[PDB]
Amino acid sequence: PRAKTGIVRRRRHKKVLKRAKGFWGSRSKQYRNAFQTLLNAATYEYRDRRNKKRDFRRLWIQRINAGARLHGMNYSTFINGLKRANIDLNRKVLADIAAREPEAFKALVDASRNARQ
Amino acid sequence: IQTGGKQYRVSEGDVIRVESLQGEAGDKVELKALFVGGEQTVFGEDAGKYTVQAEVVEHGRGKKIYIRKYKSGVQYRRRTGHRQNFTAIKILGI
Amino acid sequence: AQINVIGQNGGRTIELPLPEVNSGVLHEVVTWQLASRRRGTASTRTRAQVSKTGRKMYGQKGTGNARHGDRSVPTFVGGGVAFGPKPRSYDYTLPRQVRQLGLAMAIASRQEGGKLVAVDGFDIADAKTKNFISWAKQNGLDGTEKVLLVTDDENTRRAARNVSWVSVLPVAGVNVYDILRHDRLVIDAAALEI
Amino acid sequence: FRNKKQRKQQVKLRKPGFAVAKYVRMSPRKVRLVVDVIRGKSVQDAEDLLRFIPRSASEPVAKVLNSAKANALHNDEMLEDRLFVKEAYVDAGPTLKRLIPRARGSANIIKKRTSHITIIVAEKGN
Amino acid sequence: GSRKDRKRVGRGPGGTDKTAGRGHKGQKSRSGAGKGAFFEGG
RNA sequence: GUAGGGGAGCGUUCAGUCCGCGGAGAAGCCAUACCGGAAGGAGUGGUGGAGCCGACUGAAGUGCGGAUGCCGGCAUGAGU
RNA sequence: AAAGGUGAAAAGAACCCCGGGAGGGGAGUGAAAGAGAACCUGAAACCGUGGACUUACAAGCAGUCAUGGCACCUUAUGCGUGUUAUGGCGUGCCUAUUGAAGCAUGAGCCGGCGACUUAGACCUGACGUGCGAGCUUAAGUUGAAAAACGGAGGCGGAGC
Ligand SMILES: [K+]
Ligand SMILES: [K+]
Ligand SMILES: [K+]
Ligand SMILES: [K+]
Ligand SMILES: [Mg+2]
Ligand SMILES: [Mg+2]
Ligand SMILES: [Mg+2]
Ligand SMILES: [Mg+2]
Ligand SMILES: [Mg+2]
Ligand SMILES: [Mg+2]
Ligand SMILES: [Mg+2]
Ligand SMILES: [Mg+2]
Ligand SMILES: [Mg+2]
Ligand SMILES: [Mg+2]
Ligand SMILES: [Mg+2]
Ligand SMILES: [Mg+2]
Ligand SMILES: [Mg+2]
Ligand SMILES: [Mg+2]
Ligand SMILES: [Mg+2]
Ligand SMILES: [Mg+2]
Ligand SMILES: [Mg+2]
Ligand SMILES: [Mg+2]
Ligand SMILES: [Mg+2]
Ligand SMILES: [Mg+2]
Ligand code: NA
Ligand code: NA
């Protein structure tokens, strides 16, 4: 008994191709180039899952030291002034606090200075 | 966050890690670290005076994400399905 | 332990194969049986010698963008097949003891539900067929389930022609596949039986 | 409604203001060049431009324009003083492959394109 | 019956196919091909 | 984690068997934001105008991006 | 070499409109013309028309992640779908190699075809089953909508 490859290769291929959306060129229309894009695509996806965390952390920091600086301190001094006191252990989300509620974050700064010198 | 959503929140149902106890309306007590309840800023430790009460809404199953790996020139292509489970909790505390 | 419907009455003869019927054991059997049925059929020009084509073509080096010799090879639309179907047999000889054991275990499988025997079919009376069905309707044989008759006597077969009711089996040519194929079984004669 | 069968016998499906010249022994591209000038404009104007455009696709494009108008006027009973080229376009037809002998023994293949010039007219509607 | 009839649970195992494995290049790397005359005697 | 060894499965055609579906409409094709740990599977709609899923089991001409591969169609060079 | 297919049956389009024609639009036949005779299905490359969101100081393996704008809500008004601006990041695939994005090999694109098979009571091992100190037949004969008969022979059984 024979067994053509009928319908199989079409579906596989279509699954691949349907992945290609904002895909410029023949990346989105010719199978091979599509699949091939999908390799390096893998690479980027997987690494970016890990990377996005680095990114965000950086973001939050970049805000936090700004807040710090708005009063007369910095990020080093500020976080450190929450380490000396087991009191404040926010760390995460702090950026949102310096971005939305200024007064609160002022209070935190004042606390940091008070738990240092 | 890591677990247990503190902070000041006005009755909102959020989604975090699972909470073991399956069911519904299971009282969930959480410690605070900051909040603006009545425009009164309160730091950590002292916040222990106030605690958040939350009820479980539903045990939803995460969003479907395909995990793909690839190393060029060596073959190695990996494809496996994944969804991390959770639960929704309705914040309603002090 | 099955009692004869028409005529005598025994059923306590014939020992039953242990354990209480084993699937895999019938598996080995049926498989072997259908295997001896498969016929040798393989219309394929696997050989590159079998199809129509020359032996030389284009030059090895030179022409460029080629490198081929004949036009009958598997890589060619129209050539031969690489590793295609050859006419073969696939008929072995499943160990006798195991074939003997087979149908024993088959009947065994039928002795725990739809089992039926009968001596002498004076009720048949020529072909007719109609009175044969009428007969079945007096033996739990509605005609809802498939049945296999394994009895000698021409006149009885002659009066047995249908698809869902029963089935004719000349000269006790028993076969695990057959019995296990139909639901009820009608051994009738006590030739091979007891 | 019903299902997919009934709708078929209850409606025949008409094409208001539609003409097609199929198989025109010209390459689509040129004819595109000619058509482009009529894209969405008065049918009168249309007839007038085709009469002066120095290209030869002009002819068949013209003939089809007219056939459309003819249809809208006789088969669709439209008001010709409000007619205009709603839409028009040229698709490639089957191709005429011809074997043209080149130098040193090699041959090529001339590709003689054809065309399905279609054009569809319509009342302006303000 | 004929449909609830299973196997011996460990009788016949799937055959080894060499086409497709997202990293299969059957045989050695070099010097092993369309050549079955190496032998182990001599 | 490469060569390599071991294990569990998906998918396709044919075959037996069983449960069946089909003019109020099969397969095939087309779309899709759903499901599964992967191979994949399903719902709905569109097209179609006759046949075909699922389960279990057996057998293979059984899974393609490559081979200056084979056949065929259509592009680029250009309105040159 | 290649080349199959109207429909149940020709009733396979009388007549009218544009055109030299080809071609087409009506009308009618038929269940269907979304079957019209270079007529079953009608995938992909490839060409084109319409629409949405976009683009004319930036260096682009053509993605990926994050955010914003705009648009649409048939698995689907809040989970997302489409598109896009900007930021971060980012050296095609295969092969062959000590070492490849390589300025090393292959390849225009898509479709279809295309490669670890089969045979020999052969040899050796794993697994499974039937028998068990014994275990099995081969040719063939007789029967075939089924299979039984056939112990010439081979392996155990003592080694050196
Ligand atoms: K393997
Ligand atoms: K005509
Ligand atoms: K490869
Ligand atoms: K053994
Ligand atoms: Mg980290
Ligand atoms: Mg070349
Ligand atoms: Mg042939
Ligand atoms: Mg009618
Ligand atoms: Mg090699
Ligand atoms: Mg070497
Ligand atoms: Mg050779
Ligand atoms: Mg030798
Ligand atoms: Mg029909
Ligand atoms: Mg093959
Ligand atoms: Mg290729
Ligand atoms: Mg080259
Ligand atoms: Mg070619
Ligand atoms: Mg020019
Ligand atoms: Mg030039
Ligand atoms: Mg020039
Ligand atoms: Mg790389
Ligand atoms: Mg280069
Ligand atoms: Mg190169
Ligand atoms: Mg070289
Ligand atoms: Na699907
Ligand atoms: Na456009």
JSON list of N, CA, C and O (backbone and C1' of nucleotides) in Angstrom, two decimals, chain F residues 33 42 47 64 66-75, chain G residues 42 45-46 80 93 106-112 114-115:
[
{"chain": "F", "resi": 33, "resn": "A", "atom": "P", "xyz": [-6.47, 33.04, 16.00]},
{"chain": "F", "resi": 33, "resn": "A", "atom": "O5'", "xyz": [-6.91, 32.80, 17.50]},
{"chain": "F", "resi": 33, "resn": "A", "atom": "C5'", "xyz": [-6.01, 33.00, 18.58]},
{"chain": "F", "resi": 33, "resn": "A", "atom": "C4'", "xyz": [-6.70, 33.65, 19.74]},
{"chain": "F", "resi": 33, "resn": "A", "atom": "C3'", "xyz": [-7.97, 32.93, 20.19]},
{"chain": "F", "resi": 33, "resn": "A", "atom": "O3'", "xyz": [-8.15, 33.13, 21.59]},
{"chain": "F", "resi": 33, "resn": "A", "atom": "C1'", "xyz": [-8.51, 35.11, 19.55]},
{"chain": "F", "resi": 42, "resn": "A", "atom": "P", "xyz": [-10.17, 15.93, 15.24]},
{"chain": "F", "resi": 42, "resn": "A", "atom": "O5'", "xyz": [-10.93, 17.10, 16.03]},
{"chain": "F", "resi": 42, "resn": "A", "atom": "C5'", "xyz": [-11.81, 16.78, 17.11]},
{"chain": "F", "resi": 42, "resn": "A", "atom": "C4'", "xyz": [-12.34, 18.01, 17.83]},
{"chain": "F", "resi": 42, "resn": "A", "atom": "C3'", "xyz": [-13.31, 18.91, 17.08]},
{"chain": "F", "resi": 42, "resn": "A", "atom": "O3'", "xyz": [-14.62, 18.36, 16.95]},
{"chain": "F", "resi": 42, "resn": "A", "atom": "C1'", "xyz": [-11.75, 20.23, 18.27]},
{"chain": "F", "resi": 47, "resn": "U", "atom": "P", "xyz": [-20.95, 29.72, 1.25]},
{"chain": "F", "resi": 47, "resn": "U", "atom": "O5'", "xyz": [-19.75, 28.95, 0.55]},
{"chain": "F", "resi": 47, "resn": "U", "atom": "C5'", "xyz": [-19.09, 29.48, -0.58]},
{"chain": "F", "resi": 47, "resn": "U", "atom": "C4'", "xyz": [-17.97, 28.58, -1.02]},
{"chain": "F", "resi": 47, "resn": "U", "atom": "C3'", "xyz": [-18.41, 27.28, -1.67]},
{"chain": "F", "resi": 47, "resn": "U", "atom": "O3'", "xyz": [-18.69, 27.44, -3.04]},
{"chain": "F", "resi": 47, "resn": "U", "atom": "C1'", "xyz": [-16.76, 26.83, -0.04]},
{"chain": "F", "resi": 64, "resn": "C", "atom": "P", "xyz": [6.51, 15.81, 5.00]},
{"chain": "F", "resi": 64, "resn": "C", "atom": "O5'", "xyz": [8.06, 16.13, 4.92]},
{"chain": "F", "resi": 64, "resn": "C", "atom": "C5'", "xyz": [8.69, 16.84, 5.99]},
{"chain": "F", "resi": 64, "resn": "C", "atom": "C4'", "xyz": [9.95, 17.52, 5.52]},
{"chain": "F", "resi": 64, "resn": "C", "atom": "C3'", "xyz": [9.76, 18.55, 4.42]},
{"chain": "F", "resi": 64, "resn": "C", "atom": "O3'", "xyz": [10.70, 19.62, 4.59]},
{"chain": "F", "resi": 64, "resn": "C", "atom": "C1'", "xyz": [11.17, 16.81, 3.65]},
{"chain": "F", "resi": 66, "resn": "G", "atom": "P", "xyz": [13.49, 20.01, 0.06]},
{"chain": "F", "resi": 66, "resn": "G", "atom": "O5'", "xyz": [14.79, 19.69, -0.79]},
{"chain": "F", "resi": 66, "resn": "G", "atom": "C5'", "xyz": [16.02, 19.39, -0.17]},
{"chain": "F", "resi": 66, "resn": "G", "atom": "C4'", "xyz": [16.94, 20.58, -0.18]},
{"chain": "F", "resi": 66, "resn": "G", "atom": "C3'", "xyz": [18.43, 20.28, -0.41]},
{"chain": "F", "resi": 66, "resn": "G", "atom": "O3'", "xyz": [19.04, 21.37, -1.13]},
{"chain": "F", "resi": 66, "resn": "G", "atom": "C1'", "xyz": [18.15, 21.43, 1.60]},
{"chain": "F", "resi": 67, "resn": "A", "atom": "P", "xyz": [19.14, 21.40, -2.75]},
{"chain": "F", "resi": 67, "resn": "A", "atom": "O5'", "xyz": [20.10, 20.18, -3.10]},
{"chain": "F", "resi": 67, "resn": "A", "atom": "C5'", "xyz": [21.39, 20.08, -2.53]},
{"chain": "F", "resi": 67, "resn": "A", "atom": "C4'", "xyz": [21.86, 18.66, -2.49]},
{"chain": "F", "resi": 67, "resn": "A", "atom": "C3'", "xyz": [22.02, 17.97, -3.83]},
{"chain": "F", "resi": 67, "resn": "A", "atom": "O3'", "xyz": [23.24, 18.32, -4.47]},
{"chain": "F", "resi": 67, "resn": "A", "atom": "C1'", "xyz": [21.03, 16.51, -2.22]},
{"chain": "F", "resi": 68, "resn": "U", "atom": "P", "xyz": [23.33, 18.27, -6.06]},
{"chain": "F", "resi": 68, "resn": "U", "atom": "O5'", "xyz": [22.67, 19.65, -6.50]},
{"chain": "F", "resi": 68, "resn": "U", "atom": "C5'", "xyz": [22.92, 20.86, -5.81]},
{"chain": "F", "resi": 68, "resn": "U", "atom": "C4'", "xyz": [23.02, 22.03, -6.77]},
{"chain": "F", "resi": 68, "resn": "U", "atom": "C3'", "xyz": [22.25, 21.88, -8.09]},
{"chain": "F", "resi": 68, "resn": "U", "atom": "O3'", "xyz": [20.90, 22.31, -7.99]},
{"chain": "F", "resi": 68, "resn": "U", "atom": "C1'", "xyz": [24.48, 22.61, -8.51]},
{"chain": "F", "resi": 69, "resn": "G", "atom": "P", "xyz": [19.79, 21.87, -9.07]},
{"chain": "F", "resi": 69, "resn": "G", "atom": "O5'", "xyz": [19.69, 20.32, -8.87]},
{"chain": "F", "resi": 69, "resn": "G", "atom": "C5'", "xyz": [19.14, 19.80, -7.68]},
{"chain": "F", "resi": 69, "resn": "G", "atom": "C4'", "xyz": [19.11, 18.30, -7.69]},
{"chain": "F", "resi": 69, "resn": "G", "atom": "C3'", "xyz": [18.02, 17.66, -8.52]},
{"chain": "F", "resi": 69, "resn": "G", "atom": "O3'", "xyz": [18.40, 17.49, -9.88]},
{"chain": "F", "resi": 69, "resn": "G", "atom": "C1'", "xyz": [17.97, 16.77, -6.35]},
{"chain": "F", "resi": 70, "resn": "C", "atom": "P", "xyz": [17.54, 18.14, -11.08]},
{"chain": "F", "resi": 70, "resn": "C", "atom": "O5'", "xyz": [16.30, 17.16, -11.21]},
{"chain": "F", "resi": 70, "resn": "C", "atom": "C5'", "xyz": [16.44, 15.86, -11.75]},
{"chain": "F", "resi": 70, "resn": "C", "atom": "C4'", "xyz": [15.11, 15.16, -11.81]},
{"chain": "F", "resi": 70, "resn": "C", "atom": "C3'", "xyz": [13.97, 15.98, -12.42]},
{"chain": "F", "resi": 70, "resn": "C", "atom": "O3'", "xyz": [13.95, 15.94, -13.83]},
{"chain": "F", "resi": 70, "resn": "C", "atom": "C1'", "xyz": [13.25, 15.10, -10.37]},
{"chain": "F", "resi": 71, "resn": "C", "atom": "P", "xyz": [13.48, 17.22, -14.68]},
{"chain": "F", "resi": 71, "resn": "C", "atom": "O5'", "xyz": [11.90, 17.22, -14.49]},
{"chain": "F", "resi": 71, "resn": "C", "atom": "C5'", "xyz": [11.09, 16.18, -15.03]},
{"chain": "F", "resi": 71, "resn": "C", "atom": "C4'", "xyz": [9.66, 16.35, -14.60]},
{"chain": "F", "resi": 71, "resn": "C", "atom": "C3'", "xyz": [9.00, 17.69, -14.93]},
{"chain": "F", "resi": 71, "resn": "C", "atom": "O3'", "xyz": [8.57, 17.80, -16.28]},
{"chain": "F", "resi": 71, "resn": "C", "atom": "C1'", "xyz": [8.54, 17.12, -12.70]},
{"chain": "F", "resi": 72, "resn": "G", "atom": "P", "xyz": [8.64, 19.22, -17.05]},
{"chain": "F", "resi": 72, "resn": "G", "atom": "O5'", "xyz": [7.51, 20.07, -16.33]},
{"chain": "F", "resi": 72, "resn": "G", "atom": "C5'", "xyz": [6.17, 19.60, -16.28]},
{"chain": "F", "resi": 72, "resn": "G", "atom": "C4'", "xyz": [5.33, 20.39, -15.31]},
{"chain": "F", "resi": 72, "resn": "G", "atom": "C3'", "xyz": [5.35, 21.89, -15.48]},
{"chain": "F", "resi": 72, "resn": "G", "atom": "O3'", "xyz": [4.58, 22.32, -16.57]},
{"chain": "F", "resi": 72, "resn": "G", "atom": "C1'", "xyz": [5.46, 21.33, -13.19]},
{"chain": "F", "resi": 73, "resn": "G", "atom": "P", "xyz": [4.80, 23.75, -17.22]},
{"chain": "F", "resi": 73, "resn": "G", "atom": "O5'", "xyz": [4.32, 24.74, -16.07]},
{"chain": "F", "resi": 73, "resn": "G", "atom": "C5'", "xyz": [2.94, 25.03, -15.89]},
{"chain": "F", "resi": 73, "resn": "G", "atom": "C4'", "xyz": [2.70, 25.82, -14.62]},
{"chain": "F", "resi": 73, "resn": "G", "atom": "C3'", "xyz": [3.21, 27.25, -14.63]},
{"chain": "F", "resi": 73, "resn": "G", "atom": "O3'", "xyz": [2.30, 28.14, -15.23]},
{"chain": "F", "resi": 73, "resn": "G", "atom": "C1'", "xyz": [3.92, 26.18, -12.66]},
{"chain": "F", "resi": 74, "resn": "C", "atom": "P", "xyz": [2.84, 29.39, -16.07]},
{"chain": "F", "resi": 74, "resn": "C", "atom": "O5'", "xyz": [3.39, 30.36, -14.93]},
{"chain": "F", "resi": 74, "resn": "C", "atom": "C5'", "xyz": [2.50, 30.94, -14.00]},
{"chain": "F", "resi": 74, "resn": "C", "atom": "C4'", "xyz": [3.22, 31.54, -12.83]},
{"chain": "F", "resi": 74, "resn": "C", "atom": "C3'", "xyz": [4.19, 32.66, -13.14]},
{"chain": "F", "resi": 74, "resn": "C", "atom": "O3'", "xyz": [3.57, 33.91, -13.41]},
{"chain": "F", "resi": 74, "resn": "C", "atom": "C1'", "xyz": [5.23, 31.17, -11.67]},
{"chain": "F", "resi": 75, "resn": "A", "atom": "P", "xyz": [4.45, 35.02, -14.14]},
{"chain": "F", "resi": 75, "resn": "A", "atom": "O5'", "xyz": [5.73, 35.12, -13.20]},
{"chain": "F", "resi": 75, "resn": "A", "atom": "C5'", "xyz": [6.28, 36.39, -12.87]},
{"chain": "F", "resi": 75, "resn": "A", "atom": "C4'", "xyz": [6.93, 36.37, -11.52]},
{"chain": "F", "resi": 75, "resn": "A", "atom": "C3'", "xyz": [8.16, 37.25, -11.38]},
{"chain": "F", "resi": 75, "resn": "A", "atom": "O3'", "xyz": [7.85, 38.59, -11.14]},
{"chain": "F", "resi": 75, "resn": "A", "atom": "C1'", "xyz": [8.60, 35.12, -10.46]},
{"chain": "G", "resi": 42, "resn": "G", "atom": "P", "xyz": [-13.97, 24.63, -4.63]},
{"chain": "G", "resi": 42, "resn": "G", "atom": "O5'", "xyz": [-12.50, 25.13, -4.97]},
{"chain": "G", "resi": 42, "resn": "G", "atom": "C5'", "xyz": [-11.37, 24.46, -4.40]},
{"chain": "G", "resi": 42, "resn": "G", "atom": "C4'", "xyz": [-10.10, 24.71, -5.18]},
{"chain": "G", "resi": 42, "resn": "G", "atom": "C3'", "xyz": [-9.78, 26.19, -5.47]},
{"chain": "G", "resi": 42, "resn": "G", "atom": "O3'", "xyz": [-8.38, 26.40, -5.37]},
{"chain": "G", "resi": 42, "resn": "G", "atom": "C1'", "xyz": [-9.91, 24.97, -7.50]},
{"chain": "G", "resi": 45, "resn": "A", "atom": "P", "xyz": [0.79, 32.14, -1.82]},
{"chain": "G", "resi": 45, "resn": "A", "atom": "O5'", "xyz": [2.02, 32.09, -2.83]},
{"chain": "G", "resi": 45, "resn": "A", "atom": "C5'", "xyz": [3.32, 31.68, -2.40]},
{"chain": "G", "resi": 45, "resn": "A", "atom": "C4'", "xyz": [4.26, 31.47, -3.56]},
{"chain": "G", "resi": 45, "resn": "A", "atom": "C3'", "xyz": [4.48, 32.68, -4.47]},
{"chain": "G", "resi": 45, "resn": "A", "atom": "O3'", "xyz": [5.49, 33.56, -3.98]},
{"chain": "G", "resi": 45, "resn": "A", "atom": "C1'", "xyz": [4.08, 30.70, -5.77]},
{"chain": "G", "resi": 46, "resn": "C", "atom": "P", "xyz": [5.26, 35.15, -3.97]},
{"chain": "G", "resi": 46, "resn": "C", "atom": "O5'", "xyz": [4.79, 35.46, -5.46]},
{"chain": "G", "resi": 46, "resn": "C", "atom": "C5'", "xyz": [5.60, 35.06, -6.57]},
{"chain": "G", "resi": 46, "resn": "C", "atom": "C4'", "xyz": [4.89, 35.28, -7.89]},
{"chain": "G", "resi": 46, "resn": "C", "atom": "C3'", "xyz": [4.01, 36.53, -8.01]},
{"chain": "G", "resi": 46, "resn": "C", "atom": "O3'", "xyz": [4.72, 37.73, -8.29]},
{"chain": "G", "resi": 46, "resn": "C", "atom": "C1'", "xyz": [2.81, 34.66, -8.76]},
{"chain": "G", "resi": 80, "resn": "G", "atom": "P", "xyz": [-4.44, 39.50, 27.87]},
{"chain": "G", "resi": 80, "resn": "G", "atom": "O5'", "xyz": [-4.62, 38.62, 26.55]},
{"chain": "G", "resi": 80, "resn": "G", "atom": "C5'", "xyz": [-4.55, 39.21, 25.25]},
{"chain": "G", "resi": 80, "resn": "G", "atom": "C4'", "xyz": [-5.73, 38.80, 24.38]},
{"chain": "G", "resi": 80, "resn": "G", "atom": "C3'", "xyz": [-5.57, 39.07, 22.89]},
{"chain": "G", "resi": 80, "resn": "G", "atom": "O3'", "xyz": [-4.91, 38.03, 22.21]},
{"chain": "G", "resi": 80, "resn": "G", "atom": "C1'", "xyz": [-7.63, 39.95, 23.62]},
{"chain": "G", "resi": 93, "resn": "C", "atom": "P", "xyz": [20.80, 30.94, 11.60]},
{"chain": "G", "resi": 93, "resn": "C", "atom": "O5'", "xyz": [20.35, 29.92, 10.48]},
{"chain": "G", "resi": 93, "resn": "C", "atom": "C5'", "xyz": [19.01, 29.49, 10.40]},
{"chain": "G", "resi": 93, "resn": "C", "atom": "C4'", "xyz": [18.84, 28.43, 9.35]},
{"chain": "G", "resi": 93, "resn": "C", "atom": "C3'", "xyz": [19.84, 27.28, 9.40]},
{"chain": "G", "resi": 93, "resn": "C", "atom": "O3'", "xyz": [19.51, 26.29, 10.36]},
{"chain": "G", "resi": 93, "resn": "C", "atom": "C1'", "xyz": [19.70, 28.09, 7.19]},
{"chain": "G", "resi": 106, "resn": "G", "atom": "P", "xyz": [28.12, 26.25, -4.15]},
{"chain": "G", "resi": 106, "resn": "G", "atom": "O5'", "xyz": [26.68, 25.72, -3.77]},
{"chain": "G", "resi": 106, "resn": "G", "atom": "C5'", "xyz": [26.22, 24.47, -4.22]},
{"chain": "G", "resi": 106, "resn": "G", "atom": "C4'", "xyz": [25.00, 24.06, -3.47]},
{"chain": "G", "resi": 106, "resn": "G", "atom": "C3'", "xyz": [23.80, 24.96, -3.65]},
{"chain": "G", "resi": 106, "resn": "G", "atom": "O3'", "xyz": [23.10, 24.71, -4.85]},
{"chain": "G", "resi": 106, "resn": "G", "atom": "C1'", "xyz": [24.08, 24.47, -1.37]},
{"chain": "G", "resi": 107, "resn": "A", "atom": "P", "xyz": [23.14, 25.80, -6.04]},
{"chain": "G", "resi": 107, "resn": "A", "atom": "O5'", "xyz": [21.59, 26.07, -6.31]},
{"chain": "G", "resi": 107, "resn": "A", "atom": "C5'", "xyz": [20.57, 25.17, -5.87]},
{"chain": "G", "resi": 107, "resn": "A", "atom": "C4'", "xyz": [19.69, 25.79, -4.81]},
{"chain": "G", "resi": 107, "resn": "A", "atom": "C3'", "xyz": [19.15, 27.19, -5.09]},
{"chain": "G", "resi": 107, "resn": "A", "atom": "O3'", "xyz": [18.02, 27.19, -5.95]},
{"chain": "G", "resi": 107, "resn": "A", "atom": "C1'", "xyz": [19.80, 26.92, -2.79]},
{"chain": "G", "resi": 108, "resn": "G", "atom": "P", "xyz": [18.08, 27.93, -7.36]},
{"chain": "G", "resi": 108, "resn": "G", "atom": "O5'", "xyz": [17.22, 29.24, -7.11]},
{"chain": "G", "resi": 108, "resn": "G", "atom": "C5'", "xyz": [17.61, 30.18, -6.12]},
{"chain": "G", "resi": 108, "resn": "G", "atom": "C4'", "xyz": [16.62, 31.31, -6.03]},
{"chain": "G", "resi": 108, "resn": "G", "atom": "C3'", "xyz": [15.26, 30.94, -5.47]},
{"chain": "G", "resi": 108, "resn": "G", "atom": "O3'", "xyz": [15.20, 31.04, -4.04]},
{"chain": "G", "resi": 108, "resn": "G", "atom": "C1'", "xyz": [15.02, 32.05, -7.57]},
{"chain": "G", "resi": 109, "resn": "C", "atom": "P", "xyz": [14.58, 29.84, -3.14]},
{"chain": "G", "resi": 109, "resn": "C", "atom": "O5'", "xyz": [13.02, 30.06, -3.30]},
{"chain": "G", "resi": 109, "resn": "C", "atom": "C5'", "xyz": [12.42, 31.31, -2.97]},
{"chain": "G", "resi": 109, "resn": "C", "atom": "C4'", "xyz": [10.99, 31.38, -3.46]},
{"chain": "G", "resi": 109, "resn": "C", "atom": "C3'", "xyz": [10.14, 30.17, -3.16]},
{"chain": "G", "resi": 109, "resn": "C", "atom": "O3'", "xyz": [9.67, 30.14, -1.82]},
{"chain": "G", "resi": 109, "resn": "C", "atom": "C1'", "xyz": [9.83, 30.80, -5.40]},
{"chain": "G", "resi": 110, "resn": "C", "atom": "P", "xyz": [9.58, 28.75, -1.00]},
{"chain": "G", "resi": 110, "resn": "C", "atom": "O5'", "xyz": [8.24, 28.09, -1.59]},
{"chain": "G", "resi": 110, "resn": "C", "atom": "C5'", "xyz": [6.97, 28.69, -1.39]},
{"chain": "G", "resi": 110, "resn": "C", "atom": "C4'", "xyz": [5.91, 28.07, -2.27]},
{"chain": "G", "resi": 110, "resn": "C", "atom": "C3'", "xyz": [5.73, 26.56, -2.17]},
{"chain": "G", "resi": 110, "resn": "C", "atom": "O3'", "xyz": [4.94, 26.15, -1.04]},
{"chain": "G", "resi": 110, "resn": "C", "atom": "C1'", "xyz": [5.80, 27.19, -4.44]},
{"chain": "G", "resi": 111, "resn": "G", "atom": "P", "xyz": [4.89, 24.59, -0.62]},
{"chain": "G", "resi": 111, "resn": "G", "atom": "O5'", "xyz": [4.30, 23.88, -1.90]},
{"chain": "G", "resi": 111, "resn": "G", "atom": "C5'", "xyz": [2.94, 23.49, -1.96]},
{"chain": "G", "resi": 111, "resn": "G", "atom": "C4'", "xyz": [2.63, 22.82, -3.26]},
{"chain": "G", "resi": 111, "resn": "G", "atom": "C3'", "xyz": [3.13, 21.39, -3.39]},
{"chain": "G", "resi": 111, "resn": "G", "atom": "O3'", "xyz": [2.25, 20.45, -2.79]},
{"chain": "G", "resi": 111, "resn": "G", "atom": "C1'", "xyz": [3.73, 22.63, -5.32]},
{"chain": "G", "resi": 112, "resn": "G", "atom": "P", "xyz": [2.72, 19.56, -1.53]},
{"chain": "G", "resi": 112, "resn": "G", "atom": "O5'", "xyz": [3.03, 18.14, -2.20]},
{"chain": "G", "resi": 112, "resn": "G", "atom": "C5'", "xyz": [2.03, 17.41, -2.89]},
{"chain": "G", "resi": 112, "resn": "G", "atom": "C4'", "xyz": [2.46, 17.03, -4.29]},
{"chain": "G", "resi": 112, "resn": "G", "atom": "C3'", "xyz": [3.63, 16.06, -4.39]},
{"chain": "G", "resi": 112, "resn": "G", "atom": "O3'", "xyz": [3.27, 14.72, -4.14]},
{"chain": "G", "resi": 112, "resn": "G", "atom": "C1'", "xyz": [3.96, 17.83, -5.91]},
{"chain": "G", "resi": 114, "resn": "G", "atom": "P", "xyz": [7.60, 9.50, -3.39]},
{"chain": "G", "resi": 114, "resn": "G", "atom": "O5'", "xyz": [9.14, 9.78, -3.13]},
{"chain": "G", "resi": 114, "resn": "G", "atom": "C5'", "xyz": [10.13, 9.07, -3.85]},
{"chain": "G", "resi": 114, "resn": "G", "atom": "C4'", "xyz": [11.45, 9.77, -3.79]},
{"chain": "G", "resi": 114, "resn": "G", "atom": "C3'", "xyz": [12.08, 9.89, -2.41]},
{"chain": "G", "resi": 114, "resn": "G", "atom": "O3'", "xyz": [12.74, 8.72, -2.00]},
{"chain": "G", "resi": 114, "resn": "G", "atom": "C1'", "xyz": [12.18, 11.96, -3.50]},
{"chain": "G", "resi": 115, "resn": "A", "atom": "P", "xyz": [11.90, 7.52, -1.34]},
{"chain": "G", "resi": 115, "resn": "A", "atom": "O5'", "xyz": [12.85, 7.05, -0.15]},
{"chain": "G", "resi": 115, "resn": "A", "atom": "C5'", "xyz": [13.73, 5.94, -0.28]},
{"chain": "G", "resi": 115, "resn": "A", "atom": "C4'", "xyz": [15.07, 6.22, 0.36]},
{"chain": "G", "resi": 115, "resn": "A", "atom": "C3'", "xyz": [15.07, 6.55, 1.86]},
{"chain": "G", "resi": 115, "resn": "A", "atom": "O3'", "xyz": [15.03, 5.37, 2.69]},
{"chain": "G", "resi": 115, "resn": "A", "atom": "C1'", "xyz": [16.42, 8.12, 0.68]}
]
